[PDB]
């Protein structure tokens, strides 16, 4: 194949980790997205998703979870069935910076108050 060198392999991996991170922070920011962890294994690429609320991300019979699996397999070039996405629910979200950063952002966009929302998360 292209025979990807290691100096360009780690970079191509870190960009896939960064581009998938930004795509989900613009799409899953409502359900409490907190990050993803990848495990590059041949024929089985487990890409777990860390969210605060995972019951709504699933849907009636796993409707939204099928879209994201079909979303990255078409943008990054993954074969059919060669990629598997899993959703996990994190605990003690008060320790996650981006979880609390997006929390008060969705409340400050309404102009209610900047001192009540800040004290609410403190």
């Amino acid at each position: 194949a292209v025979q990807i060198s290691k100096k360009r392999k780690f970079v191509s991996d870190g960009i896939f980790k960064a581009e998938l991170n930004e795509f989900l922070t613009r799409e899953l920011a409502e359900d409490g997205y907190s990050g993803v962890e990848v495990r590059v294994t041949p024929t089985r690429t487990e890409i777990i998703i860390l969210a605060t609320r995972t019951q709504n991300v699933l849907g009636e019979k796993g409707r939204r979870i099928r879209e994201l699996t079909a979303v990255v397999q078409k943008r990054f070039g993954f074969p059919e069935g060669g990629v598997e996405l899993y959703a996990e629910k994190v605990a003690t979200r008060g320790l996650c910076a981006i979880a609390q950063a997006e929390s008060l952002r969705y409340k400050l966009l309404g102009g209610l108050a900047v001192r009540r929302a800040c004290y609410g998360v403190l």
Partner: protein, 55 residues
């Protein structure tokens, strides 16, 4: 017709033949290690890609 004059300039080389893969800018590009992204945005994804400051 128009398919022979629009975007007919060769894109083989030059500062405009390539752009950032994030900001689509064509200034301060970093063609090292296959990054292909502008310098002002590499600082934003330095930690996400793995270029942490071990220094």
């Amino acid at each position: 017709g128009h398919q022979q004059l629009y975007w007919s300039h060769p894109r083989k080389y030059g500062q405009g033949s390539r752009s950032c893969r994030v900001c689509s800018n064509r200034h301060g590009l970093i063609r090292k290690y296959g990054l292909n992204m502008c310098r002002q945005c590499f600082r934003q994804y330095a930690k996400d890609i793995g270029f942490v400051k071990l220094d």
